[PDB]
Enzyme design. Sequence first.
Site, PDB file in Angstrom:
ATOM      1  N   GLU A  11      10.048  75.584  50.603  1.00  0.00           N
ATOM      2  CA  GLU A  11       8.526  75.074  50.555  1.00  0.00           C
ATOM      3  C   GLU A  11       8.745  73.580  50.353  1.00  0.00           C
ATOM      4  O   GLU A  11       7.541  73.097  50.692  1.00  0.00           O
ATOM      5  CB  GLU A  11       7.838  75.785  49.138  1.00  0.00           C
ATOM      6  CG  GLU A  11       6.981  77.314  49.503  1.00  0.00           C
ATOM      7  CD  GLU A  11       6.876  77.934  50.394  1.00  0.00           C
ATOM      8  OE1 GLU A  11       5.924  79.081  50.773  1.00  0.00           O
ATOM      9  OE2 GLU A  11       5.928  76.867  51.080  1.00  0.00           O
ATOM     10  N   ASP A  20      -0.885  72.533  55.243  1.00  0.00           N
ATOM     11  CA  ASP A  20       0.746  73.432  54.987  1.00  0.00           C
ATOM     12  C   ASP A  20       0.966  73.609  56.863  1.00  0.00           C
ATOM     13  O   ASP A  20       0.184  73.417  57.451  1.00  0.00           O
ATOM     14  CB  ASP A  20       1.100  74.640  54.320  1.00  0.00           C
ATOM     15  CG  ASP A  20       0.210  75.699  54.953  1.00  0.00           C
ATOM     16  OD1 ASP A  20      -0.368  77.223  54.012  1.00  0.00           O
ATOM     17  OD2 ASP A  20      -1.055  75.488  55.955  1.00  0.00           O
ATOM     18  N   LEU A  32      -1.153  77.079  47.940  1.00  0.00           N
ATOM     19  CA  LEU A  32      -2.230  77.182  48.643  1.00  0.00           C
ATOM     20  C   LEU A  32      -3.437  76.780  47.825  1.00  0.00           C
ATOM     21  O   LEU A  32      -3.775  77.213  46.453  1.00  0.00           O
ATOM     22  CB  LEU A  32      -2.423  78.388  48.856  1.00  0.00           C
ATOM     23  CG  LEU A  32      -3.559  78.427  49.666  1.00  0.00           C
ATOM     24  CD1 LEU A  32      -3.399  77.923  50.747  1.00  0.00           C
ATOM     25  CD2 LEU A  32      -3.720  80.268  50.552  1.00  0.00           C
ATOM     26  N   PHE A 104       4.901  85.929  48.448  1.00  0.00           N
ATOM     27  CA  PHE A 104       4.379  85.121  47.753  1.00  0.00           C
ATOM     28  C   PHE A 104       4.468  83.776  49.463  1.00  0.00           C
ATOM     29  O   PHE A 104       3.158  83.342  49.877  1.00  0.00           O
ATOM     30  CB  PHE A 104       5.971  83.886  47.442  1.00  0.00           C
ATOM     31  CG  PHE A 104       6.030  82.590  47.323  1.00  0.00           C
ATOM     32  CD1 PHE A 104       5.225  80.649  47.844  1.00  0.00           C
ATOM     33  CD2 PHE A 104       5.237  82.143  46.031  1.00  0.00           C
ATOM     34  CE1 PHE A 104       5.241  79.836  47.091  1.00  0.00           C
ATOM     35  CE2 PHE A 104       5.156  80.497  45.369  1.00  0.00           C
ATOM     36  CZ  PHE A 104       5.508  79.806  46.197  1.00  0.00           C
ATOM     37  N   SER A 117       8.601  97.590  59.450  1.00  0.00           N
ATOM     38  CA  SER A 117       9.743  97.945  58.945  1.00  0.00           C
ATOM     39  C   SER A 117      10.112  98.311  57.364  1.00  0.00           C
ATOM     40  O   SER A 117      11.249  98.018  56.711  1.00  0.00           O
ATOM     41  CB  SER A 117       9.565  96.115  58.958  1.00  0.00           C
ATOM     42  OG  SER A 117       9.274  95.527  59.340  1.00  0.00           O
ATOM     43  N   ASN A 132      12.898  94.730  63.964  1.00  0.00           N
ATOM     44  CA  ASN A 132      11.425  95.000  63.352  1.00  0.00           C
ATOM     45  C   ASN A 132      10.772  93.764  62.970  1.00  0.00           C
ATOM     46  O   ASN A 132       9.212  93.167  63.261  1.00  0.00           O
ATOM     47  CB  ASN A 132      10.634  96.562  62.797  1.00  0.00           C
ATOM     48  CG  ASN A 132       9.883  96.585  63.154  1.00  0.00           C
ATOM     49  OD1 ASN A 132       8.691  96.085  61.762  1.00  0.00           O
ATOM     50  ND2 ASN A 132       8.776  97.327  63.919  1.00  0.00           N
TER      51      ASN A 132
END
EC number: 3.2.1.17
Length: 164
Positions: A11, A20, A32, A104, A117, A132
């Site tokens: 990040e 972002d 966020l 996250f 998955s 996948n």
Amino acid sequence: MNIFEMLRIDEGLRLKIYKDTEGYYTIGIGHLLTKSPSLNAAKSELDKAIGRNTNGVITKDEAEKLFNQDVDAAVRGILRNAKLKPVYDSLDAVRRAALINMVFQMGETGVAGFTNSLRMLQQKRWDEAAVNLAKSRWYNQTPNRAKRGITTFRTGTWDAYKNL
Ligand SMILES: [Cl-]
Ligand SMILES: [Cl-]
């Protein structure tokens, strides 16, 4: 390597409000603020989060405090999620970190949606799960990051992050 160092690589760290990859107002280490197009709305969420009139700028320690809170929340969201918990419990330490990273980034809801998955990871079919996982908007929109997470699930090592 650990979850904190992993996410910090993914990040980055910015002390002023920024947009972002999806164009949403964010700050710190991927925190966020809001999905709203209004900077004022973002500044207001920021102040409320920090507890002071920030004027859109925070310090390093404040960034780290939001980060600690965000990781904690991610972990707790996984454990409370009926679909996520069993997967997480089945995984080794390294792979658990990869799952936290996905939560996250996309929220508990988003990840819980990767039904197929998740079933593959639970079954320990690594190569299949990796294939996948790649068939997703997530991989097509943020390929380098997604590749790092996928490799982590595939190998069970931190290889994708050493050098970074
Ligand atoms: Cl908050
Ligand atoms: Cl990317």
